[PDB]
C-alpha cells in the first residue's frame, strides 16, 4: 500500500500568446501551493501525479472560477462516486472541498510492457469547448509496484520531464480573443529555456498528447534512436487523446531543435530550444569484432552531388506538362567528377534519388552556392561529423564546424522484419529548402549484407513534389508561383517520382519474396494508408492487408508469395485525394 494524500488546486494567471508581454490574458491554470492549502521554465502545465499498485488518491480540490470546473482522470479506473462525467462530482463551485477514491486498478497502468509508467491526461470533462480553453491539464504516472520516489524523478532513470502535444482554441472560450494563434504546452517558437541535459544519462521521458483543435501532433526528435512501444521506432508517431514516451540513450553532445512537420507545424514556428552539456558519467563500452570469422569489415566510399537541373517526367499516362526543375542528389562511383554512375535509371526507381544505405566515409559534395545537408535517421550520430543546424546559425566563413562549402567533401526488435527500415531528408530547412525536390531516401538493414562490388527490392514513395519566378512556365514571360489556386494545380503528388505513375509500370515474376522501400515525404497535412490485394504481410507476425503512415516516415513490407494469380495494389481516400490516391501494380 502506497497512500498519497494530495493538495492540488487552480489559479487564474496570464501568459503570452504570439511567442518570440504587457498583454494580459487571465485564464484558470492548475497550480500546487504549499501542502494544506489556503512558470517561465516549465510552461502552463500544472500538477504531476504518481501512482503505484494498491493505492488510493484524493485531491483536496479547490476552485476559484464562477464556471464550476471539475477534474477528470483519463485513467478510467475510477468508480461511480468519482466518475467526472454526467448524462441526463461534475461541478465544483468556489470553496467546494473534495475527496475522491481513484483506487488504482491495474487497467489504467501498464503493469508489464509499456514504458515504466503509463501516461493518461489529467484534465476536466464538463465543458471541453469554452471552460477548458484555459490550460487545465496534467500528467499521470501509474507504474509497476515499487518504483517512484517523491523527488519528481523515477528510481531506475536519471531524468524525467514531459512536454505535452495538445492545443487549446484561444478563441472558442468564454473569455475569447479575436486574434487566433494556437499553443502547445504554452511553449511554441522555442521560448522555453533549454532542458540542459548532458549525455551518458539513462534518460526517460513522457510525451502526452490530446487536443481541442482539429490537427495531429506527431513531433519528431532531432537525431536520436528512441525506445517506444516495444518496437525500435524512430519518429514519435501519435495523434491526440493518448500519450507516447521517449527513452534517450544519449552519447554525444550538441544542440538540436524538435518539431512536427506540416504547413502549420512549422510556419508559425512551433519548435523548441534544447541544449547539451558535459557530465562525467561512464557506462558500458563498445565492441568491434565477432569471433574473427563473421567480421564484416565493410565501409564504402561515396560522393553525393547537388545540381540545379530540370527533368522531364511523364508522357501519356498509363493506368507546363512534364519538365520541372529539381535539385536532387545523385550517386557516384569515383571522384573523377564524370557523369551519373547509375547509367540507366533502371525502371524500378526512376527519378528516385540515390540509394543511401559504420562511421562517415560515405561522403558527399555540395555544388551550389551554400552548404546543403545530408542527415540520416535512427542514429545518435556524433557531432564529430556534425552538420549541427542549431537554432543559432553560426557564421558563414570562419566560425564553427556547422558548414560544408561547395567542392568540399540500433538493434531493431526482431518482431519487425528481418531488418528495420528508415528514410531521411535534407536537414537544411525541413520546409523550404526541402521543398524544391531536395529529398532523398535511406535504407538501413541488418548486418547480413556483403558483396565485393556492393529477396527482391523495389523503390516507391508516395511523396509530393511540393517545390514551392516569372519566365519559368509555358507562359513565356509572365507566370506566377506560390499561388495555391495555381500551385495546387501543379502539386505533383506522386509515388516514386513522376507527376503521375508514368512509363515506369512495375511487373513481377512468381513465387519469390519482394520488398517495397515505401515511404511518405512532403508538405501535405493528411496521413495515408494502403489498400493491398489478396495477400498478407508479416507486421510483427500479424498478417494484415493494409498499413498506415504518418508524415515523413515509411517502413518495410514482408511478403510470403506462395500462390498463382494477378493482383492490383490500390489505396483509398476522400475527394481531395481520391484523384491523387491511385496507383498501378502488375504480376505475371
Amino acid at each position: 500500500a502506497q497512500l498519497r494524500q494530495f493538495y492540488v488546486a487552480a489559479q487564474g494567471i496570464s501568459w503570452s500568446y504570439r511567442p518570440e508581454s504587457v498583454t494580459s490574458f487571465k485564464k484558470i491554470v492548475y497550480r500546487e501551493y504549499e501542502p494544506y492549502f489556503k512558470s517561465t521554465i516549465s510552461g502552463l502545465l500544472g500538477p504531476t501525479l504518481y501512482a503505484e499498485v494498491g493505492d488510493i488518491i484524493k485531491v483536496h480540490f479547490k476552485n476559484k472560477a464562477d464556471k464550476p470546473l471539475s477534474i477528470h482522470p483519463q485513467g478510467i479506473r475510477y468508480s461511480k462516486l468519482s466518475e467526472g462525467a454526467s448524462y441526463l462530482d461534475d461541478a465544483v463551485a468556489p470553496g467546494r472541498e473534495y475527496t475522491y477514491e481513484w483506487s488504482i486498478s491495474e487497467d489504467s497502468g501498464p503493469t508489464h510492457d509499456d514504458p515504466p509508467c503509463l501516461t493518461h491526461i489529467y484534465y476536466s470533462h464538463e465543458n471541453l469547448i469554452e471552460d477548458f480553453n484555459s490550460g487545465l491539464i496534467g500528467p499521470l504516472l501509474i507504474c509497476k509496484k515499487g518504483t517512484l520516489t517523491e523527488g519528481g524523478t523515477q528510481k531506475t532513470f536519471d531524468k524525467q520531464i514531459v512536454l505535452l502535444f495538445a492545443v487549446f482554441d484561444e478563441s472558442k472560450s468564454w473569455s475569447q480573443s479575436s486574434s487566433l494563434m494556437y499553443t502547445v504546452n504554452g511553449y511554441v517558437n522555442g521560448t522555453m529555456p533549454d532542458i540542459t541535459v548532458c549525455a551518458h544519462d539513462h534518460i526517460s521521458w513522457h510525451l502526452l498528447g490530446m487536443s481541442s483543435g482539429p490537427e495531429l501532433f506527431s513531433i519528431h526528435f532531432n537525431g536520436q534512436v528512441l525506445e517506444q512501444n516495444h518496437h525500435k521506432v524512430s519518429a514519435i508517431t501519435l495523434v491526440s487523446a493518448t500519450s507516447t514516451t521517449a527513452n534517450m540513450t544519449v552519447g554525444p553532445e550538441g544542440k538540436w531543435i524538435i518539431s512536427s512537420l506540416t504547413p502549420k507545424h512549422l510556419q508559425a514556428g512551433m519548435q523548441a530550444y534544447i541544449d547539451i552539456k558535459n557530465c562525467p558519467k561512464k557506462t558500458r563500452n563498445l565492441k568491434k569484432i565477432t569471433r574473427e570469422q563473421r567480421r564484416h569489415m565493410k565501409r564504402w566510399e561515396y560522393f553525393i552531388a547537388a545540381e540545379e537541373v530540370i527533368w522531364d517526367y511523364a508522357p501519356v499516362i498509363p493506368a507546363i506538362g512534364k519538365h520541372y526543375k529539381k535539385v536532387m542528389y545523385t550517386q557516384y562511383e569515383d571522384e573523377s567528377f564524370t557523369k551519373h554512375t547509375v547509367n540507366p535509371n533502371m525502371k524500378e526507381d526512376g527519378i528516385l534519388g540515390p540509394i543511401i544505405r559504420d562511421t562517415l566515409k560515405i561522403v558527399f559534395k555540395n555544388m551550389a552556392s551554400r552548404p546543403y545537408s545530408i542527415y540520416p535517421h535512427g542514429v545518435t550520430f556524433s557531432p564529430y561529423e556534425d552538420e549541427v543546424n542549431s537554432s543559432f546559425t553560426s557564421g558563414r566563413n570562419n566560425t564553427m564546424i556547422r558548414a560544408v562549402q561547395p567542392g568540399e567533401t540500433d538493434e531493431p526488435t526482431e518482431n519487425d522484419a528481418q531488418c528495420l527500415t528508415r528514410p531521411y531528408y535534407s536537414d537544411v530547412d525541413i520546409m523550404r529548402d526541402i521543398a524544391s525536390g531536395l529529398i532523398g531516401l535511406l535504407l538501413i538493414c541488418k548486418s547480413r549484407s556483403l558483396d565485393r562490388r556492393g529477396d527482391i527490392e523495389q523503390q516507391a514513395v508516395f511523396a509530393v513534389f511540393d517545390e514551392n519566378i516569372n519566365k519559368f512556365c509555358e507562359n513565356p514571360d509572365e507566370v506566377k508561383r506560390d499561388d495555391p489556386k495555381f500551385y495546387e494545380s501543379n502539386i505533383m503528388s506522386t509515388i516514386n517520382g513522376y507527376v503521375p505513375e508514368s512509363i515506369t509500370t512495375l511487373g513481377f515474376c512468381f513465387d519469390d519474396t519482394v520488398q517495397w522501400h515505401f515511404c511518405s515525404v512532403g508538405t501535405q497535412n493528411e496521413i495515408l494508408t494502403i489498400h493491398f490485394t489478396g495477400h498478407s504481410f508479416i507486421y510483427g507476425k500479424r498478417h494484415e492487408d493494409t498499413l498506415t503512415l504518418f508524415p515523413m516516415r515509411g517502413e518495410s513490407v514482408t511478403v510470403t508469395m506462395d500462390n498463382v494469380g494477378t493482383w492490383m495494389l490500390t489505396s483509398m481516400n476522400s475527394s481531395p485525394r481520391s484523384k491523387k490516391l491511385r496507383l498501378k501494380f502488375r504480376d505475371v
Binding site: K80, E83, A85, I129, S211, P214, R542, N573
Partner: protein
Amino acid sequence: SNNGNRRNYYIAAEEISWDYSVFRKYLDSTFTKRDPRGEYEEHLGILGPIIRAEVDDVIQVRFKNLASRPYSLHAHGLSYEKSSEGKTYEDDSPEWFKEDNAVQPNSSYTYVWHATERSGPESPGSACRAWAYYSAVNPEKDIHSGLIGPLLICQKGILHKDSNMPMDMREFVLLFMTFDEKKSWYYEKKSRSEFHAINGMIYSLPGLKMYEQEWVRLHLLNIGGSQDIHVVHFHGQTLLENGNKQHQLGVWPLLPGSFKTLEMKASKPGWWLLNTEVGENQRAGMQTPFLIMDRDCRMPMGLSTGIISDSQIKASEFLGYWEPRLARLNNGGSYNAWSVEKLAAEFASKPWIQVDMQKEVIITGIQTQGAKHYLKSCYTTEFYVAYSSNQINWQIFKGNSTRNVMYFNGNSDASTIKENQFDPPIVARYIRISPTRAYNRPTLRLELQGCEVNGCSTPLGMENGKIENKQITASSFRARLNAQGRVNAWQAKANNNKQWLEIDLLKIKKITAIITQGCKSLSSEMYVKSYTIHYSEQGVEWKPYRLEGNTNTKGHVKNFFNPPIISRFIRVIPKTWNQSIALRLELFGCDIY
C-alpha cells in the same frame, strides 16, 4: 481455392429510408428466410449481417440489388480465384472475367471465399481478428452509405455449428465513421448517385450489450473516408491492444483503414458515457452506455414473495375464472397455473398476458414451477416474448444469440424453474408474454429476475458489526429486533412527524435502495406509512425533500427513494404512522468503495 465444406449462406440487400436521429441474412439455398435483427443486433442499423467463417472454409455470398445502384464486394487477406473483386480498370487479359464488376439486380451466384491458414489465424496471439466486406465500386459512395459488414475469423473447429456466434465472449462491430448529411445515398434524395456515430445515430443509440466479469471482441474497424484520423474517448472500462501484446495503454487515436481487436473487461456497474475527442467534433457526444449491473441478479424477483403484484397478472383473452392471479410459486392449492384454452392464432393472439414488476426492469427471463392436478399435466414446451416500452410498440423477441434462435427456447418443462438468460439488454416498461404448445393449454407462472442500474438491496448487515439497527433510537421507546428471549411486539408513542431514525450506521456507502418488510408482531403489522424524507449530512442536519413507506401489513413492499441518497448521517423522520409501529424491521442495501 476449393478447401472445405458446402453449406448455404445467403445475403441480400433491401434498401429502405432510415430516419437517422442495409442487408440481412437468409439461411436456405434460395431466398425466403427472413431472420429479424433482434436486440442481439438492434444497434447495427446501417451495418448489415456479420459474415462468419473460420480457417479456410467456404464463404458462399449470393447477393443482388433492390434499388438504383449496382453492388460488388472487396476482399482483404482472403483466398479466392481471380474474378472476385469488382472494379473497372486495366485488363492485360481479355474482357472475359468481367461479370463481377457491374452486378445487376436479382442475380444468384455461388461465390467461394476462404481464409488461408497463413492469412487467417497466424501467430495465434490474434485469436478472432476482424476482417470486412464492402462493395469497392466507390468506397466514398457505398461504404460512406453503409452497405457494410465484417468477417470475424477465429480458429478451425471449436464453435457450435451453425450458430457461428462467439461463445464465452461478446462482439462489437462499430465502424466509427463520420456519416455526414451531405453524402448519403439510399435514404437521402439529393446525392443518391459533425455526425460521429456508429451507423450515423447521434446523441442516441443505446442498447449496447455487456455481461459482468467478461471481456469483449471490440472492433474499431474504420475503413471509410480516411479523413477521420479520430481519437477515441471511452469511459467505463478501458480498451488495451492485444496481438501486438505491448500496447496496454487504454485510449487510442482511431486511424482509418486500420483495425484492432480491443478488450475491455467490464467490471464496474452502471451507466457510462462515450465521446469523440476531436475538439469541435465532440459536439456529437455519445451518451450511449452498456448498462453494467450487479453480478448477483440470478434469483427471482417478485412472484414467490409477491411484489410483482397479483392484480394485473391477467390473461388478455381470459378463460373462465382460473385467472393467473390466484397463483404463486408453488401455491398451496390445485388452481395455481395460468392456461387459457389453446386457440389457433398461430402467432398473434395465442394466450398472452401483460405483466411487470411495476417499475423499470432488466428481464433475465421467466421460469415456472407447475403443479399438475391428477390428469391435467399443465406444462408448456416453447415460448416467445414481446416488449413494449410505450404500450404501442409491442415488439417481439426473435433473437439470434448464442443460445437464442428464432423461437428461442424459454419455458419447456413441467416442474423445474427452467433457466433462461436474456443475453441482450431489456429496456422495457411492460411486455406481452405468450407460450405456445402444451397439452391443450399453455401453462405458465412467471419467475422474473431483474436488476436496475444500482439494485444493491442485499442484507446490508443490520448486525454485521459495522451498521447496527438493534439500537434503533427514535421518539417511540434500545428495542429488540432479532435479539430474542424477549417480548413479541413493537411499541410507538404518537402518530406524526415525531421520531428520528438515528440508526447507528455511520458508514459512507451506497445502500442504493431501502425496503420495509413485514413480520408477525402479535397482530397485524404496524409500520411507517410515509416519512418526510429528510436528509442526513455531516452535521446536525435535516432537509425537507428538496435534494411513502409501508402500507399493507404482509408484504415485502418498498417505496424506493427515487434519486440515490448517500451521506454520513442516517435518519428518516416518519411523517405518517400506521397507528403505531409493530414489525421486526430489516432494511436492505450494500456498500460501494
